[PDB]
Design a protein around this ligand. Structure first.
Ligand SMILES: CCCc1cc(=O)oc2cc(OC(C)=O)ccc12
Ligand SMILES: CCCc1cc(=O)oc2cc(OC(C)=O)ccc12
Length: 185
């Protein structure tokens, strides 16, 4: 791909984070803590899953960023509506306002309803996310494999401002403690 020139500097929004998450001082890295991180509750926080939003809101244009997923067993990445449900149980689907991919139990899937199997030959250590607001497109790229396409959502009905979306996943196994990291431009 040649989307690198739409690079945007994303930072994480602490106020949206699940109360177990630990966000770095530079707001570029997030990981699962082993306990509640001693923050007050608020209506923005994702309550049921280890999720957080980027601070940036996008309503037009073309945007690109990259995320490091090295040594994780489970995660989900993409964008979502600013208006997504924060409390209780929900599925990651375009009907619920999410355009995402995930790793779970040794398989990669796109967050459609029902979910779609992804075909990845080189397990990625870094993911590129491209959003074209006007075109209604969200695309995912395998940076480890020379930028190869992973998945494109087209005919997207955003229906609102978009925010970068992150899920570091649970760490029931003891093998998923590693952070998600926003990679430098
Ligand atoms: C068996 C799957 C459990 C699960 C694991 C995980 O890391 O993230 C999730 C995110 C979910 O997103 C929503 C709230 O729609 C739903 C379920 C999960
Ligand atoms: C890490 C995020 C994974 C996830 C998110 C979601 O919204 O729905 C799921 C549904 C799944 O199906 C089963 C077999 O439970 C499995 C995994 C997910």
């Amino acid at each position: 791909h040649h989307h690198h020139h739409h690079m945007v500097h994303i930072t994480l929004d602490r106020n949206t984070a699940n109360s177990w998450l630990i966000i770095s001082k530079d707001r570029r890295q997030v990981r699962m803590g082993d306990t509640h991180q001693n923050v007050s509750d608020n209506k923005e926080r994702f309550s049921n899953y280890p999720m957080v939003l980027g601070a940036q809101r996008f309503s037009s244009g073309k945007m690109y960023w990259e995320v490091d997923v090295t040594q994780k067993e489970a995660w989900d990445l993409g964008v979502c509506r600013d208006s997504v449900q924060r409390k209780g149980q929900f599925s990651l689907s375009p009907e619920n306002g999410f355009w995402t991919i995930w790793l779970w139990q040794d398989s990669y899937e796109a967050g459609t309803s029902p979910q779609t199997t992804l075909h990845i030959q080189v397990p990625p250590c870094q993911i590129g996310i491209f959003v074209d607001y006007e075109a209604g497109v969200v695309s995912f790229y395998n940076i480890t494999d020379h930028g190869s396409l992973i998945y494109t959502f087209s005919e997207c009905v955003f229906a609102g401002p978009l925010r970068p979306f992150f899920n570091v996943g649970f760490n029931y196994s003891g093998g998923n403690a590693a952070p998600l990291k926003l990679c430098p431009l």
